[PDB]
Scaffold this active site. Sequence first.
Site: not given
Ligand SMILES: Nc1ncnc2c1ncn2[C@@H]1O[C@H](COP(=O)(O)OP(=O)(O)O)[C@@H](O)[C@H]1O
Ligand code: BEF
Lengths: 528, 528, 96, 517, 98, 41
Positions: A54, A87-88, A393
């Site tokens: 997160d 966030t991320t 989340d």
């Molecule tokens: N299954 C996936 N396949 C393609 N893109 C994905 C997938 N899962 C998450 N993503 C991409 O990564 C983003 C989420 O990043 P994440 O590491 O979860 O950090 P955060 O969601 O907190 O920003 C999603 O909004 C999308 O852009």
């Molecule tokens: F990596 Be995030 F907070 F979904």
Amino acid sequence: KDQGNKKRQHGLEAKKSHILAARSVASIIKTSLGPRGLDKILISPDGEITITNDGATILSQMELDNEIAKLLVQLSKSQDDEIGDGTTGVVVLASALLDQALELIQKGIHPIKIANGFDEAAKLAISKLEETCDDISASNDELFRDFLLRAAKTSLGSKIVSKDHDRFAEMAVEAVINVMDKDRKDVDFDLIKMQGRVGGSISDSKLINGVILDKDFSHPQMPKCVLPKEGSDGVKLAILTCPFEPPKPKTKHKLDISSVEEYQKLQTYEQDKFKEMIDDVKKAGADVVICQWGFDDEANHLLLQNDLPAVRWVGGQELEHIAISTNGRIVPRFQDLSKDKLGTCSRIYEQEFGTTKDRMLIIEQSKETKTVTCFVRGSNKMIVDEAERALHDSLCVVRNLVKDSRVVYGGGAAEVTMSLAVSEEADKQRGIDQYAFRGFAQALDTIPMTLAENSGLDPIGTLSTLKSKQLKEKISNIGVDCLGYGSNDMKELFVVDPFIGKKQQILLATQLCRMILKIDNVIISGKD
Amino acid sequence: KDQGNKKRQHGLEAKKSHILAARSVASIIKTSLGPRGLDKILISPDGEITITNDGATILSQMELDNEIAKLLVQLSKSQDDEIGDGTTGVVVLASALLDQALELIQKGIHPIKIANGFDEAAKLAISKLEETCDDISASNDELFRDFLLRAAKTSLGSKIVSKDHDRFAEMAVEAVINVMDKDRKDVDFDLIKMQGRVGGSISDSKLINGVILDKDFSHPQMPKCVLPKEGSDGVKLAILTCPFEPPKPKTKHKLDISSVEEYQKLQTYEQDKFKEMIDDVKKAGADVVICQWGFDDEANHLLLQNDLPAVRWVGGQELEHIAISTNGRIVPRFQDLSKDKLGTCSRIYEQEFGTTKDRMLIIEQSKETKTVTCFVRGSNKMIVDEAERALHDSLCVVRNLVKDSRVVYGGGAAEVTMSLAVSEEADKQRGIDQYAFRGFAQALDTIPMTLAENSGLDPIGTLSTLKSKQLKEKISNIGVDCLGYGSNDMKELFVVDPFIGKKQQILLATQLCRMILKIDNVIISGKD
Amino acid sequence: EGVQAFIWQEFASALEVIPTTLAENAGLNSIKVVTELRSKHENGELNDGISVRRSGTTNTYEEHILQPVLVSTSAITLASECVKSILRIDDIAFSR
Amino acid sequence: QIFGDQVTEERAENARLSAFVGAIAVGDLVKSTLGPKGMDKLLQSASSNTCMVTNDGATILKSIPLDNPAAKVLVNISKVQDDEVGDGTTSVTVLSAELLREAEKLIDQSKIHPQTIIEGYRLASAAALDALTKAAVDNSHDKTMFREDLIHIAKTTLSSKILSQDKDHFAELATNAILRLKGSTNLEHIQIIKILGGKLSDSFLDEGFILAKKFGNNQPKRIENAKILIANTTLDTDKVKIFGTKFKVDSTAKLAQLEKAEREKMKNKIAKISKFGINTFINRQLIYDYPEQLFTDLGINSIEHADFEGVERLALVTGGEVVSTFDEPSKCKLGECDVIEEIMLGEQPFLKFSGCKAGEACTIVLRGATDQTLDEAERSLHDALSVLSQTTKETRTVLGGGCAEMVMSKAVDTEAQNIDGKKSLAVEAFARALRQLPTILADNAGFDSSELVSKLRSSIYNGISTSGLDLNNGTIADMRQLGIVESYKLKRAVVSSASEAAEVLLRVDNIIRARPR
Amino acid sequence: DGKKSLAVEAFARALRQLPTILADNAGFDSSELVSKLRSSIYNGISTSGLDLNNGTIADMRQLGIVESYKLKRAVVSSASEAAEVLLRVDNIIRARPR
Amino acid sequence: NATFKNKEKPQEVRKANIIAARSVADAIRTSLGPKGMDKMI
Ligand SMILES: Nc1ncnc2c1ncn2[C@@H]1O[C@H](COP(=O)(O)OP(=O)(O)O)[C@@H](O)[C@H]1O
Ligand code: BEF
Ligand SMILES: Nc1ncnc2c1ncn2[C@@H]1O[C@H](COP(=O)(O)OP(=O)(O)O)[C@@H](O)[C@H]1O
Ligand SMILES: Nc1ncnc2c1ncn2[C@@H]1O[C@H](COP(=O)(O)OP(=O)(O)O)[C@@H](O)[C@H]1O
Ligand SMILES: Nc1ncnc2c1ncn2[C@@H]1O[C@H](COP(=O)(O)OP(=O)(O)O)[C@@H](O)[C@H]1O
Ligand code: BEF
Ligand code: BEF
Ligand SMILES: [Mg+2]
Ligand SMILES: [Mg+2]
Ligand SMILES: [Mg+2]
């Protein structure tokens, strides 16, 4: 004043510093953006070990003194507050932007004029998205349930939880349906107890249609479970905030005792007085007692003989969920009982736990109450404590979908549609705003590129493909093959990010930029 | 005086301390006794890293403050001095003895009375060995060469050298034959230059029938090699300790020059004076010059044109080996030359070395001179510096065999014959000396047992076998299967230790004991 | 046979410490009393012992030197068991 | 810049190492405390003079201070496993760690992404965990057979500890003590009391339940056909909860009245009780001099102060109910037994009850020659009572002594036949790490582990799925044939609880320590 | 024999780690590449080598990648000596540095 | 021969315990029997 221990920065250096400081905060968390991302062990100065993908959580824990970072700390935080999933990413985009902004500066551009450039190009993207987005609520009912889930899932792929992401997703989908209404579109998270304990694996994390709480059940002899009491309408339970002890004043005391006369009457006063309550609850016709405050040795025993399982001491939020879960009323005094203010729950059992001498208890209901309890379990603290925030989340992305059924297909494509549209308007811009628009859109490209970098794909490569494909066809949604599978197209692949959030994100970064850039003077002092 | 900073020990503790301190020194080096032994990295306080299975060397390097250890340091040392191979073992036996001695003490025995017990049982073993031993010199000539070798080999099995133990053994055998005579039986190690340099592997360690030294060969133009000068009796070489520079006084100077008269004569004095020497050596009829001290620019050039390869500056021991190697005389002045005091060597070449800009030189002879040069090489310093001491170890066992052709078969059996014989006389002893004799013999058993421990054999097991077998048949020589092969019997296996040494060893330990035991009072002070 | 015999043998040999230190405290000659008592034990039995009084070896039951049988029972029972939970220690980490 | 004042960052290569080393380090601490031929480690806390020797994995790890996250993660995983099943505490860390070890291999020298190493493991785990269930036979039915089954579990769960000696003995004790409850998985119903003196083999389970605290001022030192009223009520100055009741009089005599007045309340309540017809009254609470005198003179024995747990025990052997309201005799299950005699356990007064109404509460008395031996025999037993306590709530069983994991090895090593490219490797690695358990097991015993386990795996490879490691002849005999059963929940827990550890760590690509205060 | 074999197999193993580390630096899936290489040299050829550009395994004699014999022979030697001298250590002692 | 090495060696911890432990029964030895002497702590 205090002339010494006071430093100053201004542009030549300054801006580099800040820009770089951002960039660096970024370089750490970029390796955590994606379903191929990785977590980061953070340690409290006290010694508390956490582990979590997160964004917000990470940057909050990094005890850091650089002022610009301190800002990105909140940037990821504020976003967590408003949506719960950005966030991320929000920071990544922000940094990229800064590097970009800076780059232009050394070519003669005004920092504040770049600002206005970005704010503009941004507003445009927000629109080019607000137009391409799709709708869910207004389309179907069984498909809303599905789409609403297909988001919770995508929202979990970047977490340890991923392992059992089927369950954790359908859990978050449910947990929200059951406490918010299609009309108000309001998910009050007080109506969802996110409680977790250790044991089993993360798989043994179920959802409870009531609440949990920790209780030994007042008297040991008491039963362990509680049937619906023969043909009745489920189980009825007392929900009282009055102590099973002889009533006392609330102003003074000094019950002066002149002689054996009155002391003789007090004697038999407390005595049958305990019957005055034990009877009172029997009269309302209940099965089990849930008292906010403890009972006396006498009063307890009576609750035993009278087959009245009891729950000594139950916190505010506690007692309150037991009400809303079982449809009861919080009864003040004893005489204020009644078969109609009781709790119509569906069962009560004292839950065992490995060999842990704790052994709490639970209150079920069968039918979707107005209170859910996501009860998380794991092989070790960290897995749990992460899986709880991982659950959270998703629960948030489910709330955002009722507050705005709009959805955009992520996978990076959502950010490519902007970069594409925003870059187009660049050619028309020309002059100074041309550099800005190019920049804004260019920073954006780092988002998908980073996904490619983490999933093992040549950045420039996936970008050209994602851009070409999403142009040679339609400014739609063609994402990165983050995991593999056939090909792009987040749609088939079922990759979805709530629109409402995405906007917020692509704003919060540009705005934060718009602040930093306007800073051309700095004055820090020490801790005298 | 100085009452403070002064401690005292006496028996109750004391003896335990000492005994234990010995034991502990031991525990380290026991893992280095055997052809399965291991070496120990020792580091000088300056930073010098060494690696070596040699007993003495190890215990010398352990910068240690315990007084008793300080004694075992010398115990292994003294033995190295007298024989050259005991070291690693002499201490083991010594410790074992001490533990043994101590053990008895807590049963009411007098320390000094145990002493006399041990000295006695010892003298006996020395005899029971002095009787069972075998002889080599008086048996054959080709077999003496073999046996003398079969010892050098056995003497190397516990060293890194082991790898190429064939060569290193036959090298040590030779190196000694060539500088000691069957009658005098004296190996003067000044007649054997143990020089080593880096390069290749330890395999490229040859033996030189002359000497080495480092020289560029005076003038660069000079040849690199030196033929026997057409049909001559090999090569002839100048061995002079006079500098190729204008002769000078040795009391004063001040060659007062009144006028151009005398300065005119000095002028032409030094001039042809250089011819007075360059001629002088030509006259004696030599091929190459080996001068102890350097030559002048002029004198050098002349040595060139006159085909007189030169060797500017050659140390004492240096020049001297070139004499004894080539059969020449160390000539003082220049006029003291002569074809009959030259060096009749067999060749001279300037030896190349990888790309090392050093590049020393060599002087061969074909026929076994009265000087050998074991020239050791290795892949890295430590391998060399160890392999040199490893070579030395064998060279010593070869010297001991001429000084006493007696041989005993080791493999531990040599020590079992004592333990067996000494233990027999125990039963006859009875009373107090019974405990001593039992002890002495018992400590001995640790020697073979330790070999078993290191080669991976159950100690009690190999001992019973070694004892039974060497009794059920004859108090002969049946050793431990240290490496495997068919079975015991050091004879077949060719495991041999020179007797002369073994005696010394089994003495040096008992004696050292005999000292420590007599100590019942200790008084140490600090370093004010 | 083999292992078990050597073990037992030492254990037997161990017990002789009680008489050895007894004899020693008396200033008596341990090795003497030990053996003089071993042999005298070859014929006599659980009565031939040291007696500081007699300063040598005589019958310790007739000399009224009685010792409760339980004392020596839960002496070896305990000690012998102790070593076991000591010999089981194969490392020591300081841990607070 | 950023951060500051002693905060420390470990990126990729660094972080990964910190982690791997930690776990590997922890594991290599408790590898010796495994196997029936395993050894104990002595430790000592802030008091110094607070040593303790143990073979309990979780114990050691719980104590040993560490600063390394990855290690604490493993420590903690041990306490968890120690909770939901009371055993396997060691077998889990080790298998957990060995999996990480097997991973940095697939990384640092094979160049495989950790996420793909997870991909494989997650599968390997499925297959592994599966084959367990798919091979675990149980004896829930046939209560006369599951007794034999259950007793084996203790028999073997006790080897490795000191008790391994008289294991057969404690084997029964455990079994019996659990059965004597048969229900409540809460082990706080069995009270363990220890006292120095004599062999451990002298420990016993008084099927009559022993209790500390003597009764009455000088009451009968032994009851007959006891009828006991187990109660918990205020017994030193009443007026329960009317607080605020002052006694204002205008003369000392009017005090003297109210004074004897109070001492009357006691003769009152004490009476309402005598009306219960009992020859023994046990109260959780205390009972001062006077309220006691009453009993001493009524013959009713006064045995005060037995806290909460001390009553619940009696209320399960004697069959009574707690009670605190004597507002009416009857309607109050009164407890009973044959005798409540006072016995002496090596210089100490105790109450050996006897013939109680089916004692679902018992007392085990442990006897060692040193406090160390007791305190270890204490948990060394708990490691039995806990499994068994769980197997009655999970009748499934499987054979150990290597066998179990070795079966899961052939499972994974098989399903690694149908797989993608890189992933396969992690999968093969899993079974590999699993196999390191019997290895480490045999290692401690002293055999050429490599050679032995390769023999074992060979049988389980080529059918059999029953052979195991006879850590005595150093051969590989049949485990089902040798009564080396193990709880299914246990092994399934290890193979699970560990895989989680792995995944949570492999996923780390950074570590950050803050400015410790 | 038995155990010895293992060390022997290990040798060739370590040797093989050279082309591995070689390919590694270039950036290919070293594991995969070297296993291809070893496969040719396994099944005859004894000439193929690592074209660290196409990331394939081409013929070295065909590509002028000769190396001094003294060189390679030296490495395989000078190293083995290192090994032996160290494996033989069972103790290290640092003295009181001054 | 050539079989199982035991890389590990806290062999010493045992002998270390025994010696640091036997030293205890040493200080005592003096107080055994009608010739045993008392200690003053
Ligand atoms: N299954 C996936 N396949 C393609 N893109 C994905 C997938 N899962 C998450 N993503 C991409 O990564 C983003 C989420 O990043 P994440 O590491 O979860 O950090 P955060 O969601 O907190 O920003 C999603 O909004 C999308 O852009
Ligand atoms: F990596 Be995030 F907070 F979904
Ligand atoms: N090849 C072998 N086979 C059997 N015994 C041997 C063998 N090699 C050496 N030994 C035994 O080991 C002893 C030498 O021990 P070593 O480790 O060389 O220390 P040192 O020779 O310095 O005492 C020999 O005297 C003999 O007792
Ligand atoms: N009698 C035995 N023979 C072979 N293996 C056994 C025997 N007894 C128990 N084991 C093995 O001991 C291992 C458990 O070791 P232990 O030290 O008890 O660690 P844990 O804390 O995991 O119980 C298990 O793999 C079990 O199969
Ligand atoms: N009369 C005696 N002569 C020889 N031994 C005796 C005599 N009387 C008692 N002893 C010995 O004194 C020994 C030691 O006693 P003491 O020093 O009091 O220690 P403890 O009695 O605690 O063992 C007893 O074991 C007993 O054998
Ligand atoms: F090990 Be010894 F010095 F030959
Ligand atoms: F070490 Be375990 F808990 F048997
Ligand atoms: Mg997310
Ligand atoms: Mg030698
Ligand atoms: Mg166990």
